[PDB]
């Protein structure tokens, strides 16, 4: 059962100060290897709001940043420090689990 993920590149949306959002990605695909998991990155800045969802190896880093919580089965937005713009990252190992982004279960 190969894992399914959204493989859209950097896009623009209106997800800011919201409890949940949708990736709005029209591409659903099988990653190259079943070991890979879906990873979502949020890097909003003063220029514009940016987000991305791709496949990535759980043990490999993205942009020289280690995804320590890649083993989680659900994509939970966790803050990561980065110069220039704030970093938010999540990863998930089930099928098509990066379609919807959940910032926090608090409601």
């Amino acid at each position: 059962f190969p894992q399914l993920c959204k493989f859209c590149d950097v896009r623009f949306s209106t997800c800011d100060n919201q409890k949940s959002c949708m990736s709005n990605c029209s591409i659903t695909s099988i990653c190259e290897k079943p070991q890979e998991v879906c990873v979502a990155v949020w890097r909003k800045n003063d220029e514009n709001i940016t987000l991305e969802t791709v496949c990535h190896d759980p043990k490999l880093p993205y942009h020289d940043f280690i995804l320590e919580d890649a083993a989680s089965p659900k994509c939970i937005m966790k803050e990561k420090k980065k110069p220039g713009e704030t970093f938010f990252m999540c990863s998930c190992s089930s099928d098509e689990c990066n379609d919807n982004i959940i910032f926090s279960e608090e409601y």
Binding site: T28, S29, I30
Partner: protein, 112 residues
Amino acid sequence: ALDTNYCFSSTEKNCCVRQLYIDFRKDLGWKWIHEPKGYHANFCLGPCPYIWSLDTQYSKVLALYNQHNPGASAAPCCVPQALEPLPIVYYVGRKPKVEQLSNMIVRSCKCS
């Protein structure tokens, strides 16, 4: 002779191919297929009497049995005979791929 044209032209109570739309995500759960999001998978349906498109000899024998024995529950069933592959477009990673899923669309129905 029970092709798509014959059954789609007018109503036919006996074994015929009937139009049916299959949406992958909603119907089959195949969330791995990007294009097409749905297609037409017609289905065969309709009782088979003696005077109809029976293919083999066993079908004719069973039809005769049912004709001489109404309450028997044994009769040939309307089943696919001509199948056409469905063109699909699916992504692996960032790579698009065009495939022809073999035997996905029903074009003709027989009685067996």
